[PDB]
RNA sequence: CGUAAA
């Protein structure tokens, strides 16, 4: 809808195709998840730049499934297709600053007020997941668990969502 | 200096 390819698939053949790490964490309290985030703020967006071309300056560092641009306000929210690809911008990306971009972290599931936007992870208690969340963090096609379920301690990348 | 759509 607001992805670029709206119907793709996480399969090897995919020039997008990613993995999808899962891992516990002992430390977290009972009943908690970690999901770390594949959304980019990004604000400064001139009025003459269009989604295509936010997506075509982050080429370079990260490949970008989804842009949701709203161009009065001066801000997007991007999607990367992995964790590694969206801290890579976060370092690399407009470190001369030449363009007008600022990067930071954003929040592309769960509630807002879990996220720790200065790391970029959201520390979600598994009651206050929709059954959509839930369905979603296991059959998602990139980031989630990939049919691993939801138990206490487990982490994993933000999962696709439908909106 | 703008953190949203479900």
Redesign the pocket.
């Known amino acids: 809808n607001?992805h670029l390819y709206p119907d793709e698939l996480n399969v090897s053949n995919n020039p997008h195709y990613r993995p999808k790490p899962v891992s516990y964490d002992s430390t977290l309290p009972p009943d908690h998840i970690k999901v770390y985030s594949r959304?980019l703020?990004i604000?400064?967006?001139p009025l003459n730049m269009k989604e295509w071309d936010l997506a075509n300056v982050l080429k370079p560092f990260a490949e970008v499934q989804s842009v949701?641009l709203?161009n009065s306000?001066?801000?997007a929210?991007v999607?990367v297709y992995s964790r590694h690809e969206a801290e890579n911008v976060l370092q690399n990306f407009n470190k001369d600053g030449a363009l007008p971009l600022?990067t930071?972290?954003?929040?592309?599931?769960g509630?807002?007020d879990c996220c720790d936007?200065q790391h970029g992870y959201s520390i979600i208690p598994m009651h206050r997941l929709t059954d959509?969340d839930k369905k979603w963090s296991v059959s998602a096609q990139w980031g989630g668990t990939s049919g691993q379920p939801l138990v206490t301690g487990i982490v994993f990348e933000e999962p696709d969502?439908?909106?």
């Open positions: 607001h959304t703020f604000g400064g967006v949701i709203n306000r001066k801000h929210f999607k600022r930071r972290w954003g929040v592309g599931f509630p807002r936007y959509a969502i439908i909106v």
